[PDB]
Amino acid sequence: LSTEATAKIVSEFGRDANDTGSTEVQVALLTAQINHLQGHFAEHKKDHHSRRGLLRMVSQRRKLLDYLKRKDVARYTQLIERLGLR
RNA sequence: CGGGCUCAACCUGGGAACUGCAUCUGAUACUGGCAAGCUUGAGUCUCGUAGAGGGGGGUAGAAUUCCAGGUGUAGCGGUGAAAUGCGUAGAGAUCUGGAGGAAUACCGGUGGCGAAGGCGGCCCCCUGGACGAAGACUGACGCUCAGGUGCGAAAGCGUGGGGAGCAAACAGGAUUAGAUACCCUGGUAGUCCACGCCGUAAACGAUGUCGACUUGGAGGUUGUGUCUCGUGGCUUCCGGAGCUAACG
RNA sequence: UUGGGUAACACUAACUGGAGGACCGAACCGACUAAUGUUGAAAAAUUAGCGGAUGACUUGUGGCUGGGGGUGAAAGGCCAA
RNA sequence: GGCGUAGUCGAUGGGAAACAGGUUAAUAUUCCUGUACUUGGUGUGUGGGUGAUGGAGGGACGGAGAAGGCUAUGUUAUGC
RNA sequence: UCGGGAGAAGGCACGCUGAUUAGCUCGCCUGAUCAGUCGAAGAUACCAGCUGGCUGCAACUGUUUAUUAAAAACACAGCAC
RNA sequence: GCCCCGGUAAACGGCGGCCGUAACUAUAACGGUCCUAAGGUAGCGAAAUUCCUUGUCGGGUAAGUUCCGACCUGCACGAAU
């Protein structure tokens, strides 16, 4: 994942200015990384190592979302709607 | 504690502590719940660093063997010593050429890296971790972590391929009182490649991880610095206090 | 295929789909045990049972290969009773 | 007596064209009645180009599962 | 070989009659409810697995003596030279 | 081409006998001694492939030359005969 490709995805999801660590922001990076990793599965069916690496990349997201929907349900439906998870 | 049956066991009277639970009231520092709010943490960001870290493909040289040619002697090979064996239609030794398989000098190191297993002839691609500086960011989003999940030498196993060398089992020659050992001549699986599986081990530094704290000296790897020295991380040795049954 | 748990590997539930020289069978196929029959129509049939049953199946017509032959998943089996 | 080319032969399969009705002691989508259709030849008219052999659709429309439409008939109706 | 084995096994109900409910557009379609009631027997008249255990052999379907043996015989995918 | 030597047993095959140690007795087990080189350890074995053998121990049964398990010197069982 390129630098600008990461700094741009954080801005489009950033709640406010300079927003780097947020529920909707974090999940954004994770989702992205997951998309690239999942696509990495379509090929190299042998890469069992990186396979494990996703269990967490998502367990974090699945936990962040669980935390989001738990506190604010509005920010939830909006987040998923923007990304496209579930 | 006192008293009663001659004592005691036993028993009586009184007293105290008396947990636990119900009711009412109060405090509320700490834990919990709700609401709001700061950076020196963790993580992250920016700029840099060392390395045999992992996966795929390609590639070089030396050596062993086989095949072809030349030459060529009478032996060569091999051992503690020999023999089997190979050789005058020409082995060995030697030169040239070709094919194939496996692992890969000087540098390598007492070095370095990876989470571990492991990983260095070299090159490229893909990908994990960690360290230093600026101290900027989120703003504590931390640490650990039953279960779960993945990884995990070698050996061995399934299918296909390959197979130079080496080599369990195995076929012989020696040694020996006997050797179904060591030594020697052959030799299958395997050792190798692709894929699937097993999941174990001195998987050992045999001292799980994280943070704080406690004299220093010396050698080495790496970043930075006002670099005959200061400082951060890593790898050894000797050691203060202290710790240990002892070794340490 | 859908839904759910999971990162994935995959798993579970439901649904769909329905293969399989598979099982029961219409028509029928095969045919172990006995009796009848045994100068039966004659070149081997009847009865009571019994077993297996969409395929490498069954069948009509036409055509091809012949004797020491061919053929034969070899039984010395078959090649016009 | 046998192996390639040109020709031909080989399955009432393939194969251009009609049904309905009536009639005989015995026959028929062949007789009769009505109607339809095909091929070949010629031409009155319309119309104003008439063609082996290989190749095209076509005939090889094959196997398995199956929806829907659907006939007369039958039936509900003891309707006509 | 989780495909299966399994209509395993085992047990109950299953008649008629009256009045109704549900599914569907409807059926002279289907699934049920309540009450009454007769026989020894209600799938009372048309088919039709008996079940279970141990052991020998071959794997199985299939093939084989058209006229006495289909059997542990033959073949078969697979493995090897 | 063959005699020559060597390789090959998924080549036709061969695998007898004896003593000691040791047990209450018999056998198995181990080594040797001899013959013809080895003499058999995986499994499993008197098994449809062993005479002797209705072999020995035993299950099971009132009893079973049947069968199953074990031992097993394997007359003339044993490796894709």
mmCIF file with all atom_site columns, N, CA and C (backbone and C1' of nucleotides) in Angstrom, chain E residues 55-58 72 79-80, chain F residues 10 47-48 67-69 80:
data_model
loop_
_atom_site.group_PDB
_atom_site.id
_atom_site.type_symbol
_atom_site.label_atom_id
_atom_site.label_alt_id
_atom_site.label_comp_id
_atom_site.label_asym_id
_atom_site.label_entity_id
_atom_site.label_seq_id
_atom_site.pdbx_PDB_ins_code
_atom_site.Cartn_x
_atom_site.Cartn_y
_atom_site.Cartn_z
_atom_site.occupancy
_atom_site.B_iso_or_equiv
_atom_site.pdbx_formal_charge
_atom_site.auth_seq_id
_atom_site.auth_comp_id
_atom_site.auth_asym_id
_atom_site.auth_atom_id
_atom_site.pdbx_PDB_model_num
ATOM 1  P P     . U E 1 55 ? -17.645 -64.337 12.770  1.00 0.00 ? 55 U E P     1
ATOM 2  O "O5'" . U E 1 55 ? -17.503 -65.640 11.866  1.00 0.00 ? 55 U E "O5'" 1
ATOM 3  C "C5'" . U E 1 55 ? -16.886 -66.818 12.380  1.00 0.00 ? 55 U E "C5'" 1
ATOM 4  C "C4'" . U E 1 55 ? -16.962 -67.935 11.366  1.00 0.00 ? 55 U E "C4'" 1
ATOM 5  C "C3'" . U E 1 55 ? -16.447 -67.599 9.976   1.00 0.00 ? 55 U E "C3'" 1
ATOM 6  O "O3'" . U E 1 55 ? -15.034 -67.738 9.896   1.00 0.00 ? 55 U E "O3'" 1
ATOM 7  C "C1'" . U E 1 55 ? -18.535 -68.683 9.793   1.00 0.00 ? 55 U E "C1'" 1
ATOM 8  P P     . G E 1 56 ? -14.245 -67.101 8.650   1.00 0.00 ? 56 G E P     1
ATOM 9  O "O5'" . G E 1 56 ? -14.583 -68.082 7.442   1.00 0.00 ? 56 G E "O5'" 1
ATOM 10 C "C5'" . G E 1 56 ? -14.092 -69.419 7.434   1.00 0.00 ? 56 G E "C5'" 1
ATOM 11 C "C4'" . G E 1 56 ? -14.394 -70.085 6.113   1.00 0.00 ? 56 G E "C4'" 1
ATOM 12 C "C3'" . G E 1 56 ? -14.000 -69.306 4.870   1.00 0.00 ? 56 G E "C3'" 1
ATOM 13 O "O3'" . G E 1 56 ? -12.619 -69.466 4.569   1.00 0.00 ? 56 G E "O3'" 1
ATOM 14 C "C1'" . G E 1 56 ? -16.176 -70.183 4.594   1.00 0.00 ? 56 G E "C1'" 1
ATOM 15 P P     . C E 1 57 ? -11.831 -68.284 3.817   1.00 0.00 ? 57 C E P     1
ATOM 16 O "O5'" . C E 1 57 ? -12.577 -68.160 2.416   1.00 0.00 ? 57 C E "O5'" 1
ATOM 17 C "C5'" . C E 1 57 ? -12.473 -69.195 1.443   1.00 0.00 ? 57 C E "C5'" 1
ATOM 18 C "C4'" . C E 1 57 ? -13.235 -68.823 0.194   1.00 0.00 ? 57 C E "C4'" 1
ATOM 19 C "C3'" . C E 1 57 ? -12.931 -67.454 -0.390  1.00 0.00 ? 57 C E "C3'" 1
ATOM 20 O "O3'" . C E 1 57 ? -11.755 -67.480 -1.191  1.00 0.00 ? 57 C E "O3'" 1
ATOM 21 C "C1'" . C E 1 57 ? -15.272 -67.805 -0.361  1.00 0.00 ? 57 C E "C1'" 1
ATOM 22 P P     . A E 1 58 ? -10.989 -66.107 -1.522  1.00 0.00 ? 58 A E P     1
ATOM 23 O "O5'" . A E 1 58 ? -11.921 -65.399 -2.603  1.00 0.00 ? 58 A E "O5'" 1
ATOM 24 C "C5'" . A E 1 58 ? -12.116 -65.985 -3.887  1.00 0.00 ? 58 A E "C5'" 1
ATOM 25 C "C4'" . A E 1 58 ? -13.278 -65.327 -4.596  1.00 0.00 ? 58 A E "C4'" 1
ATOM 26 C "C3'" . A E 1 58 ? -13.193 -63.821 -4.771  1.00 0.00 ? 58 A E "C3'" 1
ATOM 27 O "O3'" . A E 1 58 ? -12.413 -63.478 -5.912  1.00 0.00 ? 58 A E "O3'" 1
ATOM 28 C "C1'" . A E 1 58 ? -15.357 -64.414 -4.021  1.00 0.00 ? 58 A E "C1'" 1
ATOM 29 P P     . A E 1 72 ? -19.408 -67.262 -6.360  1.00 0.00 ? 72 A E P     1
ATOM 30 O "O5'" . A E 1 72 ? -17.953 -67.835 -6.039  1.00 0.00 ? 72 A E "O5'" 1
ATOM 31 C "C5'" . A E 1 72 ? -16.938 -66.978 -5.517  1.00 0.00 ? 72 A E "C5'" 1
ATOM 32 C "C4'" . A E 1 72 ? -15.732 -67.779 -5.071  1.00 0.00 ? 72 A E "C4'" 1
ATOM 33 C "C3'" . A E 1 72 ? -14.999 -68.581 -6.135  1.00 0.00 ? 72 A E "C3'" 1
ATOM 34 O "O3'" . A E 1 72 ? -14.051 -67.751 -6.805  1.00 0.00 ? 72 A E "O3'" 1
ATOM 35 C "C1'" . A E 1 72 ? -15.235 -69.862 -4.139  1.00 0.00 ? 72 A E "C1'" 1
ATOM 36 P P     . C E 1 79 ? -2.575  -47.068 -11.203 1.00 0.00 ? 79 C E P     1
ATOM 37 O "O5'" . C E 1 79 ? -1.766  -48.317 -10.634 1.00 0.00 ? 79 C E "O5'" 1
ATOM 38 C "C5'" . C E 1 79 ? -1.342  -48.355 -9.275  1.00 0.00 ? 79 C E "C5'" 1
ATOM 39 C "C4'" . C E 1 79 ? -0.547  -49.609 -9.008  1.00 0.00 ? 79 C E "C4'" 1
ATOM 40 C "C3'" . C E 1 79 ? 0.599   -49.878 -9.971  1.00 0.00 ? 79 C E "C3'" 1
ATOM 41 O "O3'" . C E 1 79 ? 1.768   -49.162 -9.590  1.00 0.00 ? 79 C E "O3'" 1
ATOM 42 C "C1'" . C E 1 79 ? -0.661  -51.855 -9.681  1.00 0.00 ? 79 C E "C1'" 1
ATOM 43 P P     . A E 1 80 ? 2.859   -48.774 -10.704 1.00 0.00 ? 80 A E P     1
ATOM 44 O "O5'" . A E 1 80 ? 3.498   -50.173 -11.118 1.00 0.00 ? 80 A E "O5'" 1
ATOM 45 C "C5'" . A E 1 80 ? 4.286   -50.916 -10.192 1.00 0.00 ? 80 A E "C5'" 1
ATOM 46 C "C4'" . A E 1 80 ? 4.734   -52.219 -10.810 1.00 0.00 ? 80 A E "C4'" 1
ATOM 47 C "C3'" . A E 1 80 ? 5.434   -52.109 -12.153 1.00 0.00 ? 80 A E "C3'" 1
ATOM 48 O "O3'" . A E 1 80 ? 6.815   -51.808 -11.990 1.00 0.00 ? 80 A E "O3'" 1
ATOM 49 C "C1'" . A E 1 80 ? 3.808   -53.821 -12.251 1.00 0.00 ? 80 A E "C1'" 1
ATOM 50 P P     . A F 2 10 ? 11.474  -62.425 -7.168  1.00 0.00 ? 10 A F P     1
ATOM 51 O "O5'" . A F 2 10 ? 10.033  -62.049 -7.731  1.00 0.00 ? 10 A F "O5'" 1
ATOM 52 C "C5'" . A F 2 10 ? 9.103   -63.067 -8.093  1.00 0.00 ? 10 A F "C5'" 1
ATOM 53 C "C4'" . A F 2 10 ? 8.229   -62.595 -9.231  1.00 0.00 ? 10 A F "C4'" 1
ATOM 54 C "C3'" . A F 2 10 ? 8.982   -62.079 -10.445 1.00 0.00 ? 10 A F "C3'" 1
ATOM 55 O "O3'" . A F 2 10 ? 9.329   -63.162 -11.306 1.00 0.00 ? 10 A F "O3'" 1
ATOM 56 C "C1'" . A F 2 10 ? 7.268   -60.551 -9.857  1.00 0.00 ? 10 A F "C1'" 1
ATOM 57 P P     . A F 2 47 ? -6.233  -75.615 10.067  1.00 0.00 ? 47 A F P     1
ATOM 58 O "O5'" . A F 2 47 ? -5.855  -74.377 9.136   1.00 0.00 ? 47 A F "O5'" 1
ATOM 59 C "C5'" . A F 2 47 ? -6.600  -73.161 9.187   1.00 0.00 ? 47 A F "C5'" 1
ATOM 60 C "C4'" . A F 2 47 ? -6.519  -72.443 7.860   1.00 0.00 ? 47 A F "C4'" 1
ATOM 61 C "C3'" . A F 2 47 ? -6.949  -73.271 6.660   1.00 0.00 ? 47 A F "C3'" 1
ATOM 62 O "O3'" . A F 2 47 ? -8.383  -73.291 6.570   1.00 0.00 ? 47 A F "O3'" 1
ATOM 63 C "C1'" . A F 2 47 ? -4.830  -72.278 6.236   1.00 0.00 ? 47 A F "C1'" 1
ATOM 64 P P     . A F 2 48 ? -9.175  -72.311 5.562   1.00 0.00 ? 48 A F P     1
ATOM 65 O "O5'" . A F 2 48 ? -9.103  -73.052 4.154   1.00 0.00 ? 48 A F "O5'" 1
ATOM 66 C "C5'" . A F 2 48 ? -9.940  -74.178 3.908   1.00 0.00 ? 48 A F "C5'" 1
ATOM 67 C "C4'" . A F 2 48 ? -9.502  -74.921 2.669   1.00 0.00 ? 48 A F "C4'" 1
ATOM 68 C "C3'" . A F 2 48 ? -8.012  -75.138 2.465   1.00 0.00 ? 48 A F "C3'" 1
ATOM 69 O "O3'" . A F 2 48 ? -7.609  -76.243 3.279   1.00 0.00 ? 48 A F "O3'" 1
ATOM 70 C "C1'" . A F 2 48 ? -9.082  -74.576 0.404   1.00 0.00 ? 48 A F "C1'" 1
ATOM 71 P P     . C F 2 67 ? -13.179 -76.883 10.196  1.00 0.00 ? 67 C F P     1
ATOM 72 O "O5'" . C F 2 67 ? -13.876 -75.621 10.870  1.00 0.00 ? 67 C F "O5'" 1
ATOM 73 C "C5'" . C F 2 67 ? -14.808 -74.822 10.146  1.00 0.00 ? 67 C F "C5'" 1
ATOM 74 C "C4'" . C F 2 67 ? -15.316 -73.697 11.015  1.00 0.00 ? 67 C F "C4'" 1
ATOM 75 C "C3'" . C F 2 67 ? -14.244 -72.810 11.627  1.00 0.00 ? 67 C F "C3'" 1
ATOM 76 O "O3'" . C F 2 67 ? -13.850 -71.785 10.721  1.00 0.00 ? 67 C F "O3'" 1
ATOM 77 C "C1'" . C F 2 67 ? -15.784 -73.447 13.301  1.00 0.00 ? 67 C F "C1'" 1
ATOM 78 P P     . C F 2 68 ? -12.360 -71.189 10.793  1.00 0.00 ? 68 C F P     1
ATOM 79 O "O5'" . C F 2 68 ? -12.350 -70.338 12.140  1.00 0.00 ? 68 C F "O5'" 1
ATOM 80 C "C5'" . C F 2 68 ? -13.072 -69.113 12.236  1.00 0.00 ? 68 C F "C5'" 1
ATOM 81 C "C4'" . C F 2 68 ? -12.947 -68.542 13.628  1.00 0.00 ? 68 C F "C4'" 1
ATOM 82 C "C3'" . C F 2 68 ? -11.525 -68.390 14.139  1.00 0.00 ? 68 C F "C3'" 1
ATOM 83 O "O3'" . C F 2 68 ? -10.949 -67.168 13.692  1.00 0.00 ? 68 C F "O3'" 1
ATOM 84 C "C1'" . C F 2 68 ? -12.833 -69.459 15.786  1.00 0.00 ? 68 C F "C1'" 1
ATOM 85 P P     . G F 2 69 ? -9.359  -67.067 13.491  1.00 0.00 ? 69 G F P     1
ATOM 86 O "O5'" . G F 2 69 ? -8.791  -67.035 14.978  1.00 0.00 ? 69 G F "O5'" 1
ATOM 87 C "C5'" . G F 2 69 ? -9.003  -65.899 15.811  1.00 0.00 ? 69 G F "C5'" 1
ATOM 88 C "C4'" . G F 2 69 ? -8.336  -66.096 17.151  1.00 0.00 ? 69 G F "C4'" 1
ATOM 89 C "C3'" . G F 2 69 ? -6.902  -66.596 17.104  1.00 0.00 ? 69 G F "C3'" 1
ATOM 90 O "O3'" . G F 2 69 ? -5.983  -65.533 16.879  1.00 0.00 ? 69 G F "O3'" 1
ATOM 91 C "C1'" . G F 2 69 ? -8.114  -67.851 18.696  1.00 0.00 ? 69 G F "C1'" 1
ATOM 92 P P     . A F 2 80 ? 6.415   -63.964 -5.525  1.00 0.00 ? 80 A F P     1
ATOM 93 O "O5'" . A F 2 80 ? 5.130   -63.354 -6.243  1.00 0.00 ? 80 A F "O5'" 1
ATOM 94 C "C5'" . A F 2 80 ? 4.071   -64.197 -6.684  1.00 0.00 ? 80 A F "C5'" 1
ATOM 95 C "C4'" . A F 2 80 ? 3.139   -63.431 -7.592  1.00 0.00 ? 80 A F "C4'" 1
ATOM 96 C "C3'" . A F 2 80 ? 3.818   -62.754 -8.770  1.00 0.00 ? 80 A F "C3'" 1
ATOM 97 O "O3'" . A F 2 80 ? 3.896   -63.656 -9.868  1.00 0.00 ? 80 A F "O3'" 1
ATOM 98 C "C1'" . A F 2 80 ? 2.301   -61.254 -7.718  1.00 0.00 ? 80 A F "C1'" 1
#
